[PDB]
Curated annotation (Swiss-Prot):
Top-level taxonomic group: Eukaryota
Identification of the protein by name: DNA-directed RNA polymerases I, II, and III subunit RPABC2
GO CC, one annotated term: fibrillar center
Coiled coil regions in record: none
Lineage, broadest ranks: Eukaryota, Metazoa, Chordata, Craniata, Vertebrata
Protein source organism: Homo sapiens (Human)
PANTHER family: DNA-DIRECTED RNA POLYMERASE SUBUNIT K, DNA-DIRECTED RNA POLYMERASES I, II, AND III SUBUNIT RPABC2
Record keywords, A-Z: Acetylation, DNA-directed RNA polymerase, Nucleus, Phosphoprotein, Transcription
Amino acid sequence: MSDNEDNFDGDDFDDVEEDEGLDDLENAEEEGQENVEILPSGERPQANQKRITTPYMTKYERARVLGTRALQIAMCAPVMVELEGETDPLLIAMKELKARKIPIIIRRYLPDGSYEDWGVDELIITD
């Protein structure tokens, strides 16, 4: 539709968005608990239109994101927060989450079949 949208080539973003949204441990559609995709915030989609869903990090997003970050540490990722007894990637993920040191984009699916970009930065966390 847009010039820099369809006629945009010459990009160098190295990443592979594989099938996501279906978590093995996280799966329970309920009010306030939407199915979302955990993506790494690379550019952070922005626009001149206000988002329509909730800018928060429910137990859903929190769990999905925690496991994601806990996976990063497992992959030899350094912690960006202090450890007051934490030593486990998840435990520490909670520390970083509560500290909002987790750079990630939460793609929440809409009941219509679409999705919305939600960066943790634009999300009001509850940890």
